[PDB]
Design a protein around this ligand. Structure first.
Ligand code: FES
Length: 56
């Protein structure tokens, strides 16, 4: 699903960044651009990051 429409980031793309070593929401933002242009997606993006990290 889409997480971030401003940057076109999907939940799979967030997981891809974590599977390449990102270990925090901030690093996922650095790798994907999620949440950089407005406030709408931050809550969802953080939840996807946390669920993904907890499953590793
Ligand atoms: S929807 Fe993600 S930065 Fe705007």
């Amino acid at each position: 699903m889409y997480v971030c429409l401003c940057q076109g980031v999907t939940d799979n793309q967030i997981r891809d960044a974590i599977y390449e070593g990102c270990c925090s929401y901030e690093e996922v933002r650095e790798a994907t651009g999620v949440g950089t242009q407005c406030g709408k997606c931050a809550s969802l993006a953080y939840q996807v990051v946390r669920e993904t990290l907890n499953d590793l």
